Amino acid sequence: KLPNIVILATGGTIAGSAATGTQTTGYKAGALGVDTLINAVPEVKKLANVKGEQFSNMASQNMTGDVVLKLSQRVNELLARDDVDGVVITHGTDTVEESAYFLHLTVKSDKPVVFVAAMRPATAISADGPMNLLEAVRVAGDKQSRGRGVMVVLNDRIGSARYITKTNASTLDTFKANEEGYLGVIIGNRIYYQNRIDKLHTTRSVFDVRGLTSLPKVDILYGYQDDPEYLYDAAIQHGVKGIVYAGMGAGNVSVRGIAGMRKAMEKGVVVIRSTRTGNGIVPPDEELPGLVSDSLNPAHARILLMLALTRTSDPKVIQEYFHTY
Amino acid sequence: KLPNIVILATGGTIAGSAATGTQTTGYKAGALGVDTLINAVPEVKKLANVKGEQFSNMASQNMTGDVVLKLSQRVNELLARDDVDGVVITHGTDTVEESAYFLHLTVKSDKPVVFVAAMRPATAISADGPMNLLEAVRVAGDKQSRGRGVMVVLNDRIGSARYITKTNASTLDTFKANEEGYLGVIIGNRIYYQNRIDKLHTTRSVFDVRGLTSLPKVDILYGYQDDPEYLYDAAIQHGVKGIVYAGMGAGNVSVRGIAGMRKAMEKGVVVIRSTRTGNGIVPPDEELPGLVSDSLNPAHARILLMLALTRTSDPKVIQEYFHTY
Amino acid sequence: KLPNIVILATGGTIAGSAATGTQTTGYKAGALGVDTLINAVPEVKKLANVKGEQFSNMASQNMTGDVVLKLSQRVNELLARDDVDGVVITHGTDTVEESAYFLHLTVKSDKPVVFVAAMRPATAISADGPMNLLEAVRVAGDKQSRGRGVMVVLNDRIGSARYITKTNASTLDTFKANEEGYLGVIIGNRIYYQNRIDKLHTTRSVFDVRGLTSLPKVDILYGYQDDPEYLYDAAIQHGVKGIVYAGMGAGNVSVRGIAGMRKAMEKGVVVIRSTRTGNGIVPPDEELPGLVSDSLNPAHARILLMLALTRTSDPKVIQEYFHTY
Amino acid sequence: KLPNIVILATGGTIAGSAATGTQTTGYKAGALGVDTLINAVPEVKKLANVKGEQFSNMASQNMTGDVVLKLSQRVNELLARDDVDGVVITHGTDTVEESAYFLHLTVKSDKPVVFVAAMRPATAISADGPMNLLEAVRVAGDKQSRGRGVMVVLNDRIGSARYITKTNASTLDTFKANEEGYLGVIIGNRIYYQNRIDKLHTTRSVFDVRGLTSLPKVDILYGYQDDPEYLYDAAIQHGVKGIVYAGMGAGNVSVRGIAGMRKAMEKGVVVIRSTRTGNGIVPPDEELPGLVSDSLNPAHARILLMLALTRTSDPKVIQEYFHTY
Ligand SMILES: N[C@@H](CC(=O)O)C(=O)O
Ligand SMILES: N[C@@H](CC(=O)O)C(=O)O
Ligand SMILES: N[C@@H](CC(=O)O)C(=O)O
Ligand SMILES: N[C@@H](CC(=O)O)C(=O)O
Incomplete structure (x- = not known):
């Protein structure tokens, strides 16, 4: 009855842990394991049967194409399985748009792939990661979420990987697509889908990278x-x-x-x-x-x-x- | 009784002239002289006594620091004169934010300095340059406009040089300061001033470039x-x-x-x-x-x-x- | 070879005519006939074979449901004809969102229905109506524009009737859908489609008003x-x-x-x-x-x-x- | 050495308490006392010496002019005291803009008056109230914050009461002034002041309501x-x-x-x-x-x-x- 979701962790401020509740710089992004994230929002277990996998644990400013290639390969493997209904990828905010767009072009499945991130570390007062993850799991497990391309979920918004960008250095509402808007929003525990992107992606894309080991x-x-x-x-x-x-x-x-x-x-x-x-x-x-x-x-x-x-x-x-x- | 305004022309799509009313690329930005601009909006002569000066006639993607230095030097000379109440600078949109911010830091006068530009060429259907210039002249001649720092005027908006940026490649409403807003707006032939910038500029700035001939x-x-x-x-x-x-x-x-x-x-x-x-x-x-x-x-x-x-x-x-x- | 487009005029500032180039209030919205609009942008005739029809000539603040009902009925009649490929409706900006959304729910055709309006009167310096109309005709005649729901076209943007709203009292860029973005944009004489709305409309809507003569x-x-x-x-x-x-x-x-x-x-x-x-x-x-x-x-x-x-x-x-x- | 700040509580979702971490409707706004708010962010005590006062405890949709009048009277009393450096007012989001603008016109002091609110209840996963309050206290206690008019602080932003409005029904980033921007922002435990409003307020306002007991x-x-x-x-x-x-x-x-x-x-x-x-x-x-x-x-x-x-x-x-x- 519940969807089966893999939470695939790569790092980011979402898994950041600082010495106080207001420390905004000089903490390690990607310190906390995927099971620590899961255990902080036990509510997730009422939305899906979740399994965590630690893919990497780095700050996204250090994400590289070779690694994003492997991430895309692993997500393609996961989504080919019948026991996986969707995948949520935890990532740093700085380069999420790059990684997400790469997977948007290369993941050959209509099952949802939802990147999630946090602008405040997990230890922060009013940390945004817990709710962002809960929303991302809700999106990834919803049957209406299929065939939408790769999504990026923060701050109650569902952005297409092709349009969404980090627009502000430092604010919780940074991810926007000013001209193209959001695919949907999550309000009151409900998903409101607004748009489908009018572009090729995922299952209709020519970009197969399954035989590749490096990029131009x-x-x-x-x-x-x-x-x-x-x-x-x-x-x-x-x-x-x-x-x-x-x-x-x-x-x-x-x-x-x-x-x-x-x-x-x-x-x-x-x-x-x-x-x-x-x-x-x-x-x-x-x-x-x-x-x-x-x-x-x-x-x-x-x-x-x-x-x-x-x-x-x-x-x-x-x-x-x-x-x- | 009318203010005395110098229109100092540097080039840009505002002085662009194309073969048809919808040609958007491959026309020369900075083809038309400052007197052609003035003569297309004779209404300007009811707002100010205007004099045109041709400083340069280039596309702003080719504006260089050495030239911006000279522009700042010339504007400082002009504003020291009693027969000049303000200056409107016509410029291409692509680098207006750079030139304007340079003058914001280096013009040692409280008299208004208003950059103006156009996203459509002068020949275009619904060209925005005529109204942008009229608005820029209105701003430059208004006594309430003094001491505001250098301004950028397009599309009924007055932006501070320190905040305003070209946010969109191609739209008339491109100039915005998302977090800081506009200094003012021009609606119904009237200026509505909203904000004063809380930063040093112009007469309070240490940045004197009057003895300089090149930049780092x-x-x-x-x-x-x-x-x-x-x-x-x-x-x-x-x-x-x-x-x-x-x-x-x-x-x-x-x-x-x-x-x-x-x-x-x-x-x-x-x-x-x-x-x-x-x-x-x-x-x-x-x-x-x-x-x-x-x-x-x-x-x-x-x-x-x-x-x-x-x-x-x-x-x-x-x-x-x-x-x- | 050219599409056949009917320009159905209802009024608005797009057909406004004032005594000077900067008069912003006290002019009659909906003074000019549809053939005057057409004759000011002869470029339209290279995009489509256009025919004008004068449906009404009022300011949109005076548009009423009974009239919008008739407009929807007439547009349904027109689009049932093989010699009509799409319809452009000229309208005042103040209530365009209401009229357009009504037709979005009640026009039982996939052929394009494009509302267009102007924030400055036809006589104004840098009037936006000419280019808005040209863009609206381009949209209405494009085969890629079918099945998109009713659209509202101003200032290089194509808004869905369900999302678009007049956000600003007085600016050219007023029509926006902050959370949902635009369906597309028109730049460089080309249409860029971004989104399809994920809502029922037009041919999939239950809202038939063909037998009705009044509304609740x-x-x-x-x-x-x-x-x-x-x-x-x-x-x-x-x-x-x-x-x-x-x-x-x-x-x-x-x-x-x-x-x-x-x-x-x-x-x-x-x-x-x-x-x-x-x-x-x-x-x-x-x-x-x-x-x-x-x-x-x-x-x-x-x-x-x-x-x-x-x-x-x-x-x-x-x-x-x-x-x- | 620390500023003395009164936290004057009126109610709102900031003092809301629900049965679970994701309950978004049907909880009592203004259930929790001002000391409960203070005790959830003990960090506040490193920024100021704070005292809580319970002015009212209602949902702001039920705030009325007669009560806002009394609030303005009480804030004027408080700020006349040497042992009060500023005041933070906790309030519901729905009508904060109304209450704040009233005080902007009627508080005859240059000491900071900062309204604060929360879009998620105090019990919610990733509740925004704690950080919003901390930021509001920081603003109210800063000497640079004087003479700015009444402010509204949520989501790292400082809005002028005259410009700021709730723009979105349901999102954390709802408070914006699209044309006028923010007075400042709070990032990395530091206040960045951007603008001063170019309008009359507070100590320069004619609007004295100290003798009044009702409003027109x-x-x-x-x-x-x-x-x-x-x-x-x-x-x-x-x-x-x-x-x-x-x-x-x-x-x-x-x-x-x-x-x-x-x-x-x-x-x-x-x-x-x-x-x-x-x-x-x-x-x-x-x-x-x-x-x-x-x-x-x-x-x-x-x-x-x-x-x-x-x-x-x-x-x-x-x-x-x-x-x-
Ligand atoms: N530098 C962090 C920033 C964030 O996650 O907010 C990262 O991108 O890994
Ligand atoms: N390339 C032109 C663009 C413009 O003016 O709109 C310029 O910057 O000179
Ligand atoms: N009042 C005019 C405004 C406009 O068209 O811009 C109308 O709606 O008819
Ligand atoms: N209805 C609540 C909403 C909020 O505070 O977010 C209030 O205004 O009191």
Whole structure:
């Protein structure tokens, strides 16, 4: 009768433990085990039959592509089992959007995959982790949650991995998608589903990574007044396969950036022009080098580019991925 | 009886001219002269006695610190004159926030300095430039506008240079300060002032650049999964005096970024940890390298750092600037 | 080869004509004919074969349910024709959300129905109507726009009738759905679809009004400190069939409001508890009188209640409508 | 050395106590005493010397003007004492904005007055009250907090009573001022002040209520399609002295509402046209009846109108209050 949910722990402030109730820096993110998290919210056991698995225990600023690859592989294994109805992944907030979007493109199942995180450590006064986890378990176990793509659940909100981003350095309500909104919200112990994303993901995605053991190198370069050509030269010299440009406005580029991007393209590096602004569409512009990010922000664009480079070097195909995923 | 306003033109989509009413890319930003702008909104002449001056005519993605320095010097000259009551600066949207914040720190006058820009070119259907300019002139000529710091006026809103940022690649309403709001709004031909910024600026600022002819080099490095050490090495090798880090979450840093920042500090480079998120406070953390950006986003933080480096290398002094400016 | 679009005009500031370019009040909304609108944006004729029809010419604050009923009936007639591919409805901004939501529930077609409006009159400097109309025609004629429910298009954004609301009295960017986002955006002459609404509408809706000639009376009462019982007594005395309560917080009710709501229910009036806050979920609460609005704001809740009352008085059925529509 | 702070308790979900950790409705708001609140966050005693006083213990939907009057009188008494450095007022979230704005206009002291509330009850998993109270005490005890007007503190944010409103029925981040932002934020145990409000308040306000024992009656009427004249007739018949109209768009009014407003003005009732939209400016319009609310939302506008009516019936004076307070 209860759903079977695996809580797969990777680390984060959600598993952080500090010396006092108001310590906000200098505590170890990813100190507490997945069973400690579970045991602090015994209410979870009335929503699902939960099993904890300790995948890693790191702060998400140290999450790396090779590890995210393994996480995606393990989640694909789990969801292929009949005794697993969904998976909740505990993660740090800083790079959750990157990890979640990676799994959104690579998990070949319609069963729910819900990332959860906490802006305050577990020891903190008014810690948000307990309720965030409870909400994430509720979402992962609900039959209505299937086929929605990978989700990110904090602060009563259910965000699509493709749209959601950490918008604020430090607040509980940081995760928002200003232009695209939330997939749903959790209020009064009930899920209210609002939207389905109109993009390819999960079971309809071409991005299979089950045979892979590493990913193509992609760096992100910022756009600003006086931005230097030499950062493009260094990226090329170090063997990047892609550069994502966090551009000025709508992916616009200085004379120096144009020179860098042209040098990159000459050396077989794919350039995606995204925006530093935080939101909105980078439109095509045939007068400029590179491809355009559609509404993907720089961190998301890097994840799609990395995966696109496992399949193709055809700029028409990559550009179409950015308009469809 | 009318205020005397100088319209000082630098370029931008506000002075853009395209082949049709819906062409959104591949037109020259900064094609039209300041007198063409003025002549399209003759209504401006009922609000002020206006004089146009063509300072530059470039797209703002190509605006550089050396030029912004000269702009600040020229605006300081103008505002010292009794026949100038305020100045409106037409600029591209992409880097307006950078130029405006520079002048906010360096213009030693309480007379209004209002940057204005347009998201659609002058030729576009429903072009926003005409009304934005009219509003900017109204603001610059109003006696109530004095002593407010440098302002950015688009879409009926008056933003402080210290808070306002381009939040969306492509929309008319892009300029917002999500946490700090607008200084005021212009509705029905009337200015409604809401807030005064609680920060140092203009006449209370230490940042004098009247004797300067160049600025210290500062680059911006992004924070993301797998971010590389080699970009810090390249920046150091190329003689940066500062690095602003657009960090993961609240200026958090990977093992690789920490190694880079430590190398930079060892070579006499000041590091400021800002955030890629778009909003909010990077708090102090003595366990991490560098100084923290307070609520300055990466583009603003670069401008303050550059100016701070003209005066000092004392990290206590620079850190205090970031909490006060 | 071009789509066939009917532009059905009802009035609004989009068809407003004032004496000068900055007159913001005291002009007649709905002065200009639909052919004048069309002739100001001849670009529309490259996107569709357009035909204008003058349905009404009023300011939307004077739009009434009886007229909205007829509008829905006429749109159902039009969309049943093979020579009509979609319909764009020009309307005032003040009550567009009400009219649009009514049609969202009652138009039995998957062909696009796009409401469009303008915050500045047609004569205004930087009038937004021309571009809003062009965007609305583009949306209505696109094959990808089918089956999305009724849409509201201003300022480069495509809002669902069920979520979108006028959030600001006076700004061009007023239409937003803070929690649910936009269905899509129009940038660079291209439509970017983001979301499909996860609610019943149009072809899946039970709300048929083709045989009807009037609608049940529903009033809206506000919630605030010292709110009076006597307004409930007056509404009952005047024969309301429903009351929507724009409640304090999450539909919460004073001792006086509870007395009023109980009196209403005793006299056969259905009460829906909504919120004055502007956003979010009113959860069920069996300790309080009436039904709950889910995330419907007061204006939308009134439209659903009115339609629900044409079909049923069963509070279980009405409550389920509020969770599904 | 520590500041002396009085915690003056009125009730609310902050003092709510439910049977389980996830019960969201049907619990008594204002069950717990002020000493229970204090004893749950002993950390408060390291920030201030605190004394609790139980002013009332009600749910804020039942807060009434007569009681808010007494609260303002008591806070004025407290702040006149040398042994009180500031006051924190615990209150329900639903009408906090009304009570806080009343005190903003009537407390004749520059010492901090900080309202605090909680969206989750004290018993709830991840209850927000403890941290909100700690933050409110920090704000009230800080010397930099003086002369800022009355503040509302939840979720790491410090809102001005004049701008802040509950924007969402049910979320922790509900309190926002979309156009005006926050006065400050509290992150990492530190206050970051961003703005000072550019409006009259507290020590510069004319609104003295120290001799008063009751307030003029003011009701709020909503604006919508088919809005009825009879609600104006009932309000007049019941002796209102003011009506605030939560208007369609920018305070716009139907033919029926105009008839009602004219009848009200004929009987000596002052009408203020506000907006139901949630934000922005209602501009003057001499073609319409009544005065305009500037950017005051309906709940705030009622509080100012009530106080304005204790002093004057001169519409020029009242209109100027709405532009200055
Ligand atoms: N640095 C932490 C921040 C958080 O979890 O809130 C992490 O991302 O692991
Ligand atoms: N690239 C243009 C964009 C704009 O002005 O909207 C500029 O910044 O010059
Ligand atoms: N009162 C006008 C406002 C607008 O269209 O902007 C209307 O709703 O008809
Ligand atoms: N109804 C409660 C809601 C809250 O405090 O959150 C109150 O306002 O008293």
